[PDB]
Swiss-Prot record:
Exists either covalently attached to another protein, or free (unanchored). When covalently bound, it is conjugated to target proteins via an isopeptide bond either as a monomer (monoubiquitin), a polymer linked via different Lys residues of the ubiquitin (polyubiquitin chains) or a linear polymer linked via the initiator Met of the ubiquitin (linear polyubiquitin chains). There is a cross-link at K6, K11, K27, K29, K33, K48, K63 (Glycyl lysine isopeptide (Lys-Gly) (interchain with G-Cter in ubiquitin)). This is Ubiquitin. Changing H68G: Loss of DTX3L-mediated polyubiquitination of histone H3 and H4. The chain holds residues 1 to 76 of 128 of the full protein.
Amino acid sequence: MQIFVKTLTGKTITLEVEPSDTIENVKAKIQDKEGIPPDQQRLIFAGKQLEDGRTLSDYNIQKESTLHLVLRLRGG
């Protein structure tokens, strides 16, 4: 479904996806959209990081949910 992710700048970015799509798919969508890679993408939810292997549905996300789109701290 659709959700509303926030930026490190407190910006509002909405993304329309499916409940069957994985976090990686949603991230990939945001990538092609915004331009930020999924490798450098850090979405926080319920205090837990969105796992690619984990889908929005598996997360029981609510319509127009509030997601935190933060970058990565370190690297490797």
